[PDB]
Each structure stands twice: as structure tokens, then as C-alpha cells.
PDB file of C-alpha atoms and ligand atoms in Angstrom:
ATOM      1  CA  UNK A  29      30.605 156.499  54.186  1.00 43.66           C
ATOM      2  CA  UNK A  30      28.606 157.844  57.317  1.00 43.78           C
ATOM      3  CA  UNK A  31      30.701 157.989  60.495  1.00 47.32           C
ATOM      4  CA  UNK A  32      33.942 157.253  58.804  1.00 46.60           C
ATOM      5  CA  UNK A  33      37.379 159.338  58.539  1.00 49.02           C
ATOM      6  CA  UNK A  34      39.408 160.889  55.710  1.00 47.09           C
ATOM      7  CA  UNK A  35      41.648 157.961  54.560  1.00 45.16           C
ATOM      8  CA  UNK A  36      44.440 160.066  53.480  1.00 46.65           C
ATOM      9  CA  UNK A  37      45.506 160.410  49.781  1.00 42.50           C
ATOM     10  CA  UNK A  38      46.387 157.137  48.097  1.00 43.81           C
ATOM     11  CA  UNK A  39      46.382 155.177  51.304  1.00 43.57           C
ATOM     12  CA  UNK A  40      43.839 152.757  49.669  1.00 43.12           C
ATOM     13  CA  UNK A  41      45.702 152.262  46.216  1.00 41.16           C
ATOM     14  CA  UNK A  42      43.021 149.657  44.919  1.00 40.90           C
ATOM     15  CA  UNK A  43      40.110 151.846  45.143  1.00 41.46           C
ATOM     16  CA  UNK A  44      38.696 153.241  41.888  1.00 43.59           C
ATOM     17  CA  UNK A  45      35.952 155.814  41.087  1.00 44.40           C
ATOM     18  CA  UNK A  46      33.596 154.858  38.132  1.00 43.97           C
ATOM     19  CA  UNK A  47      32.953 158.000  36.354  1.00 45.33           C
ATOM     20  CA  UNK A  48      30.128 158.898  33.781  1.00 45.53           C
ATOM     21  CA  UNK A  49      30.770 162.679  33.862  1.00 42.35           C
ATOM     22  CA  UNK A  50      30.489 162.542  37.657  1.00 42.20           C
ATOM     23  CA  UNK A  51      31.286 159.855  40.234  1.00 43.09           C
ATOM     24  CA  UNK A  52      28.519 157.243  40.640  1.00 42.24           C
ATOM     25  CA  UNK A  53      30.012 154.012  42.022  1.00 42.79           C
ATOM     26  CA  UNK A  54      33.346 152.633  43.455  1.00 45.73           C
ATOM     27  CA  UNK A  55      35.313 149.562  42.503  1.00 46.82           C
ATOM     28  CA  UNK A  56      38.479 147.658  43.406  1.00 47.71           C
ATOM     29  CA  UNK A  57      41.511 147.052  40.986  1.00 49.93           C
ATOM     30  CA  UNK A  58      42.377 143.193  41.105  1.00 50.60           C
ATOM     31  CA  UNK A  59      45.156 143.170  38.305  1.00 50.10           C
ATOM     32  CA  UNK A  60      46.447 145.927  35.982  1.00 48.24           C
ATOM     33  CA  UNK A  61      43.495 145.463  33.533  1.00 47.92           C
ATOM     34  CA  UNK A  62      40.492 144.450  35.500  1.00 48.16           C
ATOM     35  CA  UNK A  63      38.318 145.943  38.250  1.00 49.07           C
ATOM     36  CA  UNK A  64      35.551 144.415  40.271  1.00 48.17           C
ATOM     37  CA  UNK A  65      32.421 146.412  41.206  1.00 44.57           C
ATOM     38  CA  UNK A  66      28.778 145.747  41.747  1.00 43.55           C
ATOM     39  CA  UNK A  67      26.526 144.582  38.885  1.00 43.79           C
ATOM     40  CA  UNK A  68      23.861 147.278  40.015  1.00 42.05           C
ATOM     41  CA  UNK A  69      26.562 149.892  38.912  1.00 41.33           C
ATOM     42  CA  UNK A  70      26.447 148.734  35.361  1.00 44.00           C
ATOM     43  CA  UNK A  71      25.869 151.358  32.645  1.00 43.85           C
ATOM     44  CA  UNK A  72      27.712 152.037  29.276  1.00 45.04           C
ATOM     45  CA  UNK A  73      30.210 155.049  29.024  1.00 44.28           C
ATOM     46  CA  UNK A  74      32.349 154.193  32.076  1.00 43.25           C
ATOM     47  CA  UNK A  75      35.617 155.817  32.637  1.00 45.66           C
ATOM     48  CA  UNK A  76      37.585 154.192  35.559  1.00 45.23           C
ATOM     49  CA  UNK A  77      39.664 156.636  37.629  1.00 43.89           C
ATOM     50  CA  UNK A  78      42.557 155.295  39.515  1.00 42.91           C
ATOM     51  CA  UNK A  79      44.885 156.954  42.035  1.00 40.96           C
ATOM     52  CA  UNK A  80      42.157 159.348  42.980  1.00 39.23           C
ATOM     53  CA  UNK A  81      41.739 161.184  46.351  1.00 40.33           C
ATOM     54  CA  UNK A  82      39.819 164.503  45.603  1.00 41.77           C
ATOM     55  CA  UNK A  83      37.529 163.466  42.761  1.00 39.72           C
ATOM     56  CA  UNK A  84      36.830 167.169  41.752  1.00 42.25           C
ATOM     57  CA  UNK A  85      40.541 168.159  41.415  1.00 40.94           C
ATOM     58  CA  UNK A  86      43.392 166.838  39.298  1.00 42.86           C
ATOM     59  CA  UNK A  87      46.325 166.781  41.906  1.00 44.94           C
ATOM     60  CA  UNK A  88      48.644 164.211  40.360  1.00 43.33           C
ATOM     61  CA  UNK A  89      48.728 160.287  40.553  1.00 43.24           C
ATOM     62  CA  UNK A  90      45.401 159.955  38.655  1.00 41.46           C
ATOM     63  CA  UNK A  91      45.065 157.545  35.778  1.00 40.22           C
ATOM     64  CA  UNK A  92      41.732 157.832  33.746  1.00 40.39           C
ATOM     65  CA  UNK A  93      41.203 154.730  31.536  1.00 42.61           C
ATOM     66  CA  UNK A  94      37.917 153.825  29.758  1.00 44.67           C
ATOM     67  CA  UNK A  95      36.343 150.576  30.256  1.00 45.95           C
ATOM     68  CA  UNK A  96      36.643 148.115  27.179  1.00 46.13           C
ATOM     69  CA  UNK A  97      33.741 145.878  28.484  1.00 46.04           C
ATOM     70  CA  UNK A  98      31.748 145.278  31.750  1.00 47.63           C
ATOM     71  CA  UNK A  99      30.632 141.611  32.532  1.00 46.72           C
ATOM     72  CA  UNK A 100      27.736 141.443  34.817  1.00 47.25           C
ATOM     73  CA  UNK A 101      27.224 138.215  36.710  1.00 46.21           C
ATOM     74  CA  UNK A 102      24.826 136.087  34.380  1.00 46.54           C
ATOM     75  CA  UNK A 103      22.713 135.231  37.463  1.00 46.87           C
ATOM     76  CA  UNK A 104      22.396 138.823  38.778  1.00 48.91           C
ATOM     77  CA  UNK A 105      18.925 139.467  39.906  1.00 48.37           C
ATOM     78  CA  UNK A 106      18.056 143.203  40.214  1.00 47.48           C
ATOM     79  CA  UNK A 107      15.170 142.666  42.440  1.00 48.25           C
ATOM     80  CA  UNK A 108      17.032 140.710  45.218  1.00 45.98           C
ATOM     81  CA  UNK A 109      20.520 141.936  44.266  1.00 46.29           C
ATOM     82  CA  UNK A 110      21.708 138.256  44.636  1.00 44.90           C
ATOM     83  CA  UNK A 111      25.078 137.917  42.567  1.00 45.21           C
ATOM     84  CA  UNK A 112      25.609 141.624  42.714  1.00 46.88           C
ATOM     85  CA  UNK A 113      29.149 141.531  41.180  1.00 50.74           C
ATOM     86  CA  UNK A 114      30.588 142.820  37.819  1.00 52.97           C
ATOM     87  CA  UNK A 115      33.965 142.755  36.258  1.00 52.52           C
ATOM     88  CA  UNK A 116      35.213 145.766  33.986  1.00 50.28           C
ATOM     89  CA  UNK A 117      38.162 145.094  31.695  1.00 52.09           C
ATOM     90  CA  UNK A 118      40.272 148.380  31.043  1.00 53.39           C
ATOM     91  CA  UNK A 119      40.824 149.596  27.566  1.00 52.95           C
ATOM     92  CA  UNK A 120      44.552 149.689  28.450  1.00 55.68           C
ATOM     93  CA  UNK A 121      46.506 148.402  31.488  1.00 53.47           C
ATOM     94  CA  UNK A 122      47.078 150.636  34.527  1.00 50.20           C
ATOM     95  CA  UNK A 123      50.644 151.535  35.595  1.00 51.24           C
ATOM     96  CA  UNK A 124      50.824 150.003  39.082  1.00 52.17           C
ATOM     97  CA  UNK A 125      53.101 151.359  41.690  1.00 52.49           C
ATOM     98  CA  UNK A 126      52.495 152.353  45.269  1.00 52.07           C
ATOM     99  CA  UNK A 127      49.582 154.813  44.726  1.00 53.30           C
ATOM    100  CA  UNK A 128      47.794 152.416  42.271  1.00 55.20           C
ATOM    101  CA  UNK A 129      48.007 148.779  43.174  1.00 52.98           C
ATOM    102  CA  UNK A 130      45.663 145.761  43.087  1.00 52.31           C
ATOM    103  CA  UNK A 131      44.122 144.101  45.987  1.00 55.62           C
ATOM    104  CA  UNK A 132      44.172 140.036  46.370  1.00 54.28           C
ATOM    105  CA  UNK A 133      41.192 137.929  46.057  1.00 52.23           C
ATOM    106  CA  UNK A 134      40.505 135.653  49.122  1.00 51.13           C
ATOM    107  CA  UNK A 135      41.411 132.013  49.592  1.00 50.37           C
ATOM    108  CA  UNK A 136      38.773 131.517  52.191  1.00 50.76           C
ATOM    109  CA  UNK A 137      35.763 133.453  53.333  1.00 51.91           C
ATOM    110  CA  UNK A 138      36.120 135.656  56.519  1.00 54.00           C
ATOM    111  CA  UNK A 139      34.411 134.893  59.670  1.00 52.87           C
ATOM    112  CA  UNK A 140      32.056 137.064  61.750  1.00 52.37           C
ATOM    113  CA  UNK A 141      34.072 139.342  63.930  1.00 53.59           C
ATOM    114  CA  UNK A 142      36.699 140.018  61.282  1.00 52.10           C
ATOM    115  CA  UNK A 143      37.475 143.767  61.105  1.00 53.47           C
ATOM    116  CA  UNK A 144      37.640 145.102  57.554  1.00 54.96           C
ATOM    117  CA  UNK A 145      38.197 148.495  55.868  1.00 54.01           C
ATOM    118  CA  UNK A 146      35.362 149.933  53.817  1.00 55.89           C
ATOM    119  CA  UNK A 147      36.115 153.190  51.562  1.00 54.47           C
ATOM    120  CA  UNK A 148      34.418 155.342  49.196  1.00 53.98           C
ATOM    121  CA  UNK A 149      33.138 158.821  48.115  1.00 54.58           C
ATOM    122  CA  UNK A 150      29.415 158.058  48.980  1.00 55.57           C
ATOM    123  CA  UNK A 151      27.060 160.097  51.044  1.00 53.41           C
ATOM    124  CA  UNK A 152      28.316 160.917  54.621  1.00 55.16           C
ATOM    125  CA  UNK A 153      24.768 161.610  56.004  1.00 51.48           C
ATOM    126  CA  UNK A 154      22.118 159.032  56.930  1.00 52.58           C
ATOM    127  CA  UNK A 155      19.446 161.589  56.532  1.00 53.72           C
ATOM    128  CA  UNK A 156      20.058 163.865  53.586  1.00 55.32           C
ATOM    129  CA  UNK A 157      22.912 164.010  50.941  1.00 55.21           C
ATOM    130  CA  UNK A 158      26.487 165.284  51.494  1.00 55.08           C
ATOM    131  CA  UNK A 159      29.018 163.817  49.058  1.00 55.43           C
ATOM    132  CA  UNK A 160      32.809 164.319  49.977  1.00 54.67           C
ATOM    133  CA  UNK A 161      35.539 165.534  47.649  1.00 55.17           C
ATOM    134  CA  UNK A 162      38.039 163.114  49.265  1.00 55.49           C
ATOM    135  CA  UNK A 163      37.996 159.444  50.109  1.00 55.79           C
ATOM    136  CA  UNK A 164      36.413 158.267  53.302  1.00 56.71           C
ATOM    137  CA  UNK A 165      37.211 155.161  55.213  1.00 55.32           C
ATOM    138  CA  UNK A 166      35.507 153.078  57.903  1.00 54.61           C
ATOM    139  CA  UNK A 167      36.649 150.093  59.769  1.00 53.51           C
ATOM    140  CA  UNK A 168      33.546 147.683  60.359  1.00 55.56           C
ATOM    141  CA  UNK A 169      33.263 144.142  61.627  1.00 55.02           C
ATOM    142  CA  UNK A 170      31.525 141.208  59.624  1.00 53.03           C
ATOM    143  CA  UNK A 171      28.445 140.291  61.568  1.00 51.12           C
ATOM    144  CA  UNK A 172      27.204 136.636  62.335  1.00 50.07           C
ATOM    145  CA  UNK A 173      24.606 135.161  59.809  1.00 52.91           C
ATOM    146  CA  UNK A 174      21.896 135.143  62.638  1.00 54.86           C
ATOM    147  CA  UNK A 175      22.276 138.821  63.223  1.00 50.75           C
ATOM    148  CA  UNK A 176      22.322 139.607  59.443  1.00 52.85           C
ATOM    149  CA  UNK A 177      19.292 137.280  58.800  1.00 53.81           C
ATOM    150  CA  UNK A 178      17.419 138.771  61.813  1.00 58.16           C
ATOM    151  CA  UNK A 179      17.990 142.215  60.520  1.00 53.27           C
ATOM    152  CA  UNK A 180      16.773 141.556  56.869  1.00 55.98           C
ATOM    153  CA  UNK A 181      14.535 138.303  57.327  1.00 54.85           C
ATOM    154  CA  UNK A 182      14.220 136.501  53.897  1.00 54.75           C
ATOM    155  CA  UNK A 183      16.463 138.946  52.011  1.00 52.34           C
ATOM    156  CA  UNK A 184      19.899 137.440  52.726  1.00 51.09           C
ATOM    157  CA  UNK A 185      21.145 134.879  50.367  1.00 49.74           C
ATOM    158  CA  UNK A 186      24.443 132.834  50.821  1.00 49.79           C
ATOM    159  CA  UNK A 187      26.160 135.288  48.462  1.00 51.80           C
ATOM    160  CA  UNK A 188      25.713 138.042  50.964  1.00 51.82           C
ATOM    161  CA  UNK A 189      27.098 139.157  54.421  1.00 51.63           C
ATOM    162  CA  UNK A 190      26.399 141.958  56.713  1.00 54.59           C
ATOM    163  CA  UNK A 191      29.146 144.110  58.279  1.00 51.97           C
ATOM    164  CA  UNK A 192      28.682 147.284  60.370  1.00 51.03           C
ATOM    165  CA  UNK A 193      27.141 148.514  63.646  1.00 55.35           C
ATOM    166  CA  UNK A 194      23.652 147.681  64.822  1.00 54.63           C
ATOM    167  CA  UNK A 195      23.769 150.689  67.073  1.00 58.43           C
ATOM    168  CA  UNK A 196      23.825 152.931  63.935  1.00 55.97           C
ATOM    169  CA  UNK A 197      26.078 155.834  63.119  1.00 58.17           C
ATOM    170  CA  UNK A 198      28.802 154.185  60.934  1.00 61.60           C
ATOM    171  CA  UNK A 199      28.059 152.593  57.506  1.00 61.28           C
ATOM    172  CA  UNK A 200      28.568 152.686  53.851  1.00 64.07           C
ATOM    173  CA  UNK A 201      25.861 154.622  51.714  1.00 63.80           C
ATOM    174  CA  UNK A 202      24.903 155.560  48.312  1.00 62.98           C
ATOM    175  CA  UNK A 203      27.941 156.398  46.170  1.00 62.46           C
ATOM    176  CA  UNK A 204      29.940 153.764  47.885  1.00 63.20           C
ATOM    177  CA  UNK A 205      28.234 150.968  45.901  1.00 66.29           C
ATOM    178  CA  UNK A 206      30.819 148.807  44.016  1.00 65.23           C
ATOM    179  CA  UNK A 207      33.473 149.512  46.442  1.00 65.51           C
ATOM    180  CA  UNK A 208      35.797 147.310  48.636  1.00 70.91           C
ATOM    181  CA  UNK A 209      35.361 145.695  51.940  1.00 72.17           C
ATOM    182  CA  UNK A 210      39.125 144.418  52.553  1.00 73.40           C
ATOM    183  CA  UNK A 211      39.881 142.306  55.545  1.00 73.78           C
ATOM    184  CA  UNK A 212      43.396 141.005  56.289  1.00 72.77           C
ATOM    185  CA  UNK A 213      44.585 142.418  52.981  1.00 72.81           C
ATOM    186  CA  UNK A 214      41.967 140.257  50.885  1.00 73.79           C
ATOM    187  CA  UNK A 215      38.868 141.717  49.036  1.00 74.19           C
ATOM    188  CA  UNK A 216      36.161 139.875  50.909  1.00 78.23           C
ATOM    189  CA  UNK A 217      33.138 142.066  49.989  1.00 77.30           C
ATOM    190  CA  UNK A 218      31.597 144.625  47.516  1.00 77.04           C
ATOM    191  CA  UNK A 219      29.352 147.420  48.843  1.00 79.93           C
ATOM    192  CA  UNK A 220      25.905 146.291  47.733  1.00 81.60           C
ATOM    193  CA  UNK A 221      22.778 147.628  49.680  1.00 79.84           C
ATOM    194  CA  UNK A 222      21.260 148.359  53.030  1.00 82.45           C
ATOM    195  CA  UNK A 223      18.043 149.996  54.345  1.00 81.53           C
ATOM    196  CA  UNK A 224      18.951 153.685  54.489  1.00 83.50           C
ATOM    197  CA  UNK A 225      22.257 154.492  55.792  1.00 81.82           C
ATOM    198  CA  UNK A 226      23.732 154.076  59.449  1.00 84.55           C
ATOM    199  CA  UNK A 227      20.276 153.276  60.764  1.00 82.71           C
ATOM    200  CA  UNK A 228      20.060 151.268  64.024  1.00 81.54           C
ATOM    201  CA  UNK A 229      19.688 147.585  63.496  1.00 85.63           C
ATOM    202  CA  UNK A 230      20.006 148.023  59.733  1.00 83.68           C
ATOM    203  CA  UNK A 231      23.665 147.035  58.948  1.00 85.48           C
ATOM    204  CA  UNK A 232      25.214 147.157  55.338  1.00 83.23           C
ATOM    205  CA  UNK A 233      24.881 144.105  53.092  1.00 83.24           C
ATOM    206  CA  UNK A 234      27.769 143.111  50.862  1.00 82.80           C
ATOM    207  CA  UNK A 235      28.443 140.655  48.109  1.00 81.86           C
ATOM    208  CA  UNK A 236      30.387 137.694  49.439  1.00 81.14           C
ATOM    209  CA  UNK A 237      33.488 137.593  47.073  1.00 80.40           C
ATOM    210  CA  UNK A 238      34.968 134.469  48.415  1.00 80.49           C
ATOM    211  CA  UNK A 239      31.888 132.587  46.528  1.00 77.42           C
ATOM    212  CA  UNK A 240      32.934 134.173  43.152  1.00 75.66           C
ATOM    213  CA  UNK A 241      36.684 133.589  42.984  1.00 74.95           C
ATOM    214  CA  UNK A 242      36.637 130.692  40.515  1.00 76.54           C
ATOM    215  CA  UNK A 243      34.098 132.632  38.400  1.00 78.73           C
ATOM    216  CA  UNK A 244      36.307 135.732  38.408  1.00 80.05           C
ATOM    217  CA  UNK A 245      39.309 133.611  37.449  1.00 79.06           C
ATOM    218  CA  UNK A 246      37.516 131.683  34.654  1.00 81.16           C
ATOM    219  CA  UNK A 247      35.960 134.887  33.264  1.00 76.57           C
ATOM    220  CA  UNK A 248      39.208 137.040  33.286  1.00 77.01           C
ATOM    221  CA  UNK A 249      40.946 133.984  31.593  1.00 77.90           C
ATOM    222  CA  UNK A 250      38.547 133.748  28.738  1.00 74.63           C
ATOM    223  CA  UNK A 251      38.272 137.566  28.029  1.00 78.59           C
TER     224      UNK A 251
HETATM  225  N1  LIG B  16      23.405 151.217  53.910  1.00 78.08           N
HETATM  226  C1  LIG B  16      24.194 150.898  53.166  1.00 78.08           C
HETATM  227  N2  LIG B  16      25.209 150.263  53.568  1.00 78.08           N
HETATM  228  C2  LIG B  16      24.022 151.142  51.756  1.00 78.08           C
HETATM  229  C3  LIG B  16      25.334 150.806  50.886  1.00 78.08           C
HETATM  230  C4  LIG B  16      25.131 151.006  49.518  1.00 78.08           C
HETATM  231  C5  LIG B  16      24.083 151.635  49.037  1.00 78.08           C
HETATM  232  N3  LIG B  16      23.669 151.906  47.873  1.00 78.08           N
HETATM  233  C6  LIG B  16      22.685 152.530  47.911  1.00 78.08           C
HETATM  234  C7  LIG B  16      21.961 153.000  46.682  1.00 78.08           C
HETATM  235  C8  LIG B  16      20.633 153.727  46.764  1.00 78.08           C
HETATM  236  C9  LIG B  16      20.066 154.198  45.529  1.00 78.08           C
HETATM  237  O1  LIG B  16      19.032 154.743  45.583  1.00 78.08           O
HETATM  238  C10 LIG B  16      18.830 156.141  45.420  1.00 78.08           C
HETATM  239  F1  LIG B  16      19.400 156.733  44.314  1.00 78.08           F
HETATM  240  F2  LIG B  16      17.388 156.368  45.504  1.00 78.08           F
HETATM  241  F3  LIG B  16      19.208 156.665  46.663  1.00 78.08           F
HETATM  242  C11 LIG B  16      20.760 153.874  44.342  1.00 78.08           C
HETATM  243  C12 LIG B  16      22.036 153.277  44.315  1.00 78.08           C
HETATM  244  C13 LIG B  16      22.714 152.780  45.378  1.00 78.08           C
HETATM  245  O2  LIG B  16      23.786 152.070  45.328  1.00 78.08           O
HETATM  246  N4  LIG B  16      22.073 152.465  49.041  1.00 78.08           N
HETATM  247  C14 LIG B  16      23.006 152.022  49.738  1.00 78.08           C
HETATM  248  C15 LIG B  16      22.986 151.800  51.028  1.00 78.08           C
HETATM  249 CA1  LIG B  17      41.808 164.218  41.969  1.00 79.27          CA
END
């Protein structure tokens, strides 16, 4: 997260860190046994870390659970990142409480102007790499479709939305992929891609979760 602030330990209780011997992506806990992340974060050997704040130190509240299976959306396209969503089922259910809690899926899509909270342990520099130890937060608004499409002509599908600042300086970045975009207490986006990080006129692009709620419910129900 570039231009963000330290969230404070366990203030974002649905945030998870996907770890394969190091933190590589974020995710959101939606029920005690399922996490939603981005299909481009897929890999085998995933350990889901819940109740985390400092990813390099065990300080208490952490729950490390291995993933039993990861389900990448069947229509995920790695070249366009269309349908960039993945569900991970945990080997055992997490103990939910106030430091570890799930986030609700939306009943409707959010409109431009909605203010949302994006969080993660991704890069905090737009030029160079600086990865934090603790969770960073950023409040960003969803942009209108014309500004999004004008920023990335021909690369935005109806399963994507832009959120951020066209003036630059504040944005999600590498390491934040797979993490949550929560607006009015509902999970509306998944950090997906962007051109560089916090560059002027190049906002972040997020998977539009309201278009996958029926798929998420049907898939969890049959697995
Ligand atoms: N500007 C943004 N809002 C943004 C958000 C997530 C990103 N994730 C990545 C990303 C970049 C990668 O390429 C690299 F390893 F060469 F840097 C790899 C994975 C990513 O998720 N870039 C990103 C940019
Ligand atoms: Ca820790």
C-alpha cells in the first residue's frame, strides 16, 4: 500500500496473508473455512495466516491453517486478468472472535464515489520495493466507469472497477494482490492489477465481487 497508514493490530479482522515460506498475497476470510483471493495468487503449498499484524513476528492471535484446495474461477484469463478471483477452502475451520472475523459479501454493487478501505502488506513505494512488517490501510473511492476506461482503454471488462486517486501517491501495490476492498462493511473488490503503483492517472483495478456472489455461494455449497 503506497500513501496508506498503519491500520493498528487486528483492526481488519478479515484480512489474511497467504504464505508459502514468505507473504506473497492477501485474501479475505468470508466464513470460518473459506477465503477469497485473486486467481493470479494461485500456487500450491499455501498456508493461510489469520489474525496477523506483524508478519515476521508471532505476537499472539495468529492462526496458521493450510489450504485444503484452491478453486480458481474456470473462466480466469491470465492475459487480461478477467475473472481474477479464487476461493481457498481451509484444512480446518478458523476460530472466529473479534481479531479474526469474516466479512460479508455484497447484496448490490457499489457506485462510484463510494469510499472503501483497502489493506495489505504490499510494497509501500511506487518506485522501488519496501515491504512493511505490519498491515497498512488506505481509504480510496471507487471511480466512475468513464474515468476507469479512459485510464486503461480496452483493458477494463465489466468484472473490474477502478478505485484510487488519479493525482497519484496513494494506491495498492505488489504484495497487496488478493486482498480486500471493503465498502460499507461489504467485500466489493479484490486487489487485482494496475500500471506501476500510485502513478498519476493510473488508478488500481479491482475484481468486481458483486458479479460473483452466486458463483461463490454455489461453489462453497458444492465443496
Ligand atoms: N497499482 C496497483 N494498484 C497494483 C495492485 C496490485 C498489483 N499487483 C501487482 C503485481 C505485480 C507483479 O509483478 C512483479 F513481480 F514483476 F512486480 C506480480 C504480481 C502482482 O500481483 N502489481 C500491482 C499493482
Ligand atoms: Ca505476527
